[PDB]
Ligand binder design. Structure first.
Ligand SMILES: *C(=N)c1nnc(-c2ccccc2)o1
Length: 460
C-alpha cells in the first residue's frame, strides 16, 4: 500500500460562547454553509486529518472528543484516532486522523502560551499541536486573542508572544520559531480583529451583509489592513473571504447581529466582524491549496458561527537509501555562490550562518562573513564563495529536490539569531548555478534578506 504524496486537512475554528453545542454539527466538518464550500459529491470522503480549535469551550475534553468522533463516524463511517488534545482554560485543540495514519504520525508535541500581564493574563492565549506525518512536519495553532475593536495593537502583541514562546516541533531547530519549524503551519482561532467602521454605521453594515456585499466591509477588516502594513502575520496566507461576518449573532437564529453596547459587553459595541479565521504558511514550493473557506449557517448555540477551511497539502515519505540515514551520500552536495545577507540592524558585530535541514546529519556553522556598508545606510554581510559545501544524507533527486534549508544569521558576539529564513531545493536544474532568495525575520518581523546562488548535485 503506497505512501501518500498529498493529504487533505480540515481546520475548524469555533468560539462556542460557553454554551453546549447542538445535537448535529456535521455541516461544519462537511464545509457547508456560506463562502467557499465543499462539493456534495465529496461528503463521504474523509479528510486525512481533522484539526478542531475551540474558544470559550464549556465541555470536558472527554465530552468534546465523544461529540467529534460521533460526528465524523456519522459522516464517513470511519472511527478516527485521537492524535492529540490540549486545553488552556477554555481554549482547546483536537487533532484526529484516519486510523491508516496511526503509524505515519510521530513526534507529537503540544504546548500553550498565556498572553498579557496580570489584568490581561487569565483567559487569552493559544494552544498548539505539532507532529511529523512521514517526512513532513505539521504545526497547528489555535489562538484566542484580545477582544475589542480598539485593541488591534494588543492582538498583534499577542501574535508575537505566541510566535516567540510556543514550543513545538524539533527542539534542535534552536534559532527558529514556529514560523520556520514546519513544512505546513496552520494558525487559526478567534483572532478577534474587527471591521473598523464608525459605530453609527452599524445598520448600514448589516444591510451590506444582507446583500452579500462584503467588499466595503473587508477593506476595513483590521486583520487584512494590519497584514497589508506588515504589522502581523508576515508571510502567512489567507483564502479570500466570501462568507458573512461570523460575530456577533443573537443566539438560536442567524437572522440578527447583536452589536449594541450592553453591560455584558463592558459597554462596547461589537460591529459585525470576521473574528474567526484560518491562515497558513508553508515552505517555499510545497503544494498547499485551499479547497474550502466558509462558515456554517445551521449551528446557532453561540454568538459566533463555526468557520471551516480545508487544504490539499504535499507530503513526503520517510526516505531510506543504502547510505543515509546514518551516513552521508558522497554523490549529493549543496554549494552556495556569491551569497550575502542584507540586515536592518544598526549593530556592528561579526555574523555567521547556520544551515539546518532534515537532509543533513546535523546543522552546519559557516565562518564569519565580511561586513560592508550598503548604499542606503544598511549592513551587508558578504559570504562570497566562502560558505561550506553541505553533505546531504541522501543524494537521490526524488528526495533531495523536496527538501529545504533553514538559514539563521547569528552574531559572533552573542550567538543570538538576527534573522531566519528558508530556501527550497525544488530547483529548475541541478549542477547549474541558480538564484536563491529568502526574506529574514526575527520574532516574526522582517530583519533583512539573504540572496545568492545555489548549485545542487544529486545522484542524477
Ligand atoms: C515535541 N514536543 C517535540 N520535541 N522534539 C520533537 C521533534 C524531534 C524531531 C523531529 C521532529 C520533532 O518534537
Amino acid at each position: 500500500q503506497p505512501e501518500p504524496d498529498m493529504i487533505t486537512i480540515f481546520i475548524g475554528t469555533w468560539n462556542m460562547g460557553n454554551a453546549p453545542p447542538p445535537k448535529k454539527i456535521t455541516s461544519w466538518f462537511l464545509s457547508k454553509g456560506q463562502g467557499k464550500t465543499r462539493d456534495d459529491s465529496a461528503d463521504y470522503i474523509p479528510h486525512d486529518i481533522y484539526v478542531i480549535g475551540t474558544q470559550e469551550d464549556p465541555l470536558s475534553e472527554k465530552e468534546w472528543l465523544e461529540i467529534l468522533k460521533h460526528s465524523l463516524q456519522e459522516i464517513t463511517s470511519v472511527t478516527f484516532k485521537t492524535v492529540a488534545i490540549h486545553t488552556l482554560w477554555n481554549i482547546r485543540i483536537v487533532v484526529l486522523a484516519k486510523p491508516e495514519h496511526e503509524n505515519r504520525i510521530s513526534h507529537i508535541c503540544t504546548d500553550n502560551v498565556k498572553t498579557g500581564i496580570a489584568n490581561t493574563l487569565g483567559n487569552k492565549g493559544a494552544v498548539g499541536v505539532s507532529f511529523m506525518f512521514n517526512g513532513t512536519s505539521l504545526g497547528f495553532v489555535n489562538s484566542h486573542l484580545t477582544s475589542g475593536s480598539e485593541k488591534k495593537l494588543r492582538r498583534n502583541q499577542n501574535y508575537m508572544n505566541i510566535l516567540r514562546f510556543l514550543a513545538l516541533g524539533d527542539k534542535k531547530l534552536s534559532p527558529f520559531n514556529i514560523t520556520h519549524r514546519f513544512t505546513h503551519l496552520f494558525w487559526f482561532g478567534d483572532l478577534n480583529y474587527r471591521v473598523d467602521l464608525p459605530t453609527w454605521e452599524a445598520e448600514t453594515i448589516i444591510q451590506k451583509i444582507k446583500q452579500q456585499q462584503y467588499a466595503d466591509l473587508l477593506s476595513h477588516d483590521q486583520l487584512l489592513t494590519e497584514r497589508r502594513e506588515q504589522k502581523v502575520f508576515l508571510h502567512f496566507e489567507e483564502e479570500e473571504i466570501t462568507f458573512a461576518p461570523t460575530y456577533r449573532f443573537e443566539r438560536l437564529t442567524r437572522d440578527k447581529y447583536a452589536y449594541t453596547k450592553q453591560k455584558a459587553t463592558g459597554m462596547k459595541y461589537n460591529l459585525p466582524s470576521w473574528c474567526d479565521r484560518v491562515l497558513w504558511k508553508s515552505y517555499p514550493l510545497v503544494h498547499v491549496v485551499c479547497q474550502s473557506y466558509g462558515s456554517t449557517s445551521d449551528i446557532m448555540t453561540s454568538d459566533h458561527s463555526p468557520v471551516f477551511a480545508t487544504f490539499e497539502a504535499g507530503v513526503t515519505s520517510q526516505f531510506v537509501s543504502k547510505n543515509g540515514p546514518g551516513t552521508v551520500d558522497s554523490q549529493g552536495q549543496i554549494e552556495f555562490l556569491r551569497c550575502y545577507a542584507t540586515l536592518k540592524t544598526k549593530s556592528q558585530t561579526k555574523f555567521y550562518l547556520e544551515f539546518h535541514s532534515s537532509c543533513l546529519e546535523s546543522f552546519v556553522k559557516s565562518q564569519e562573513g565580511e561586513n560592508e556598508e550598503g548604499s542606503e545606510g544598511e549592513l551587508v554581510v558578504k559570504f562570497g564563495e566562502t560558505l561550506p559545501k553541505l553533505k546531504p544524507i541522501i543524494s537521490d533527486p526524488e528526495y533531495l529536490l523536496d527538501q529545504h534549508i533553514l538559514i539563521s544569521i547569528k552574531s559572533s558576539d552573542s550567538d543570538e539569531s538576527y534573522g531566519e529564513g528558508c530556501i527550497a531545493l525544488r530547483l529548475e536544474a541541478t549542477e547549474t548555478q541558480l538564484p536563491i532568495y529568502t526574506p529574514l525575520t526575527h520574532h516574526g518581523e522582517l530583519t533583512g534578506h539573504f540572496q545568492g546562488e545555489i548549485k545542487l548535485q544529486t545522484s542524477q
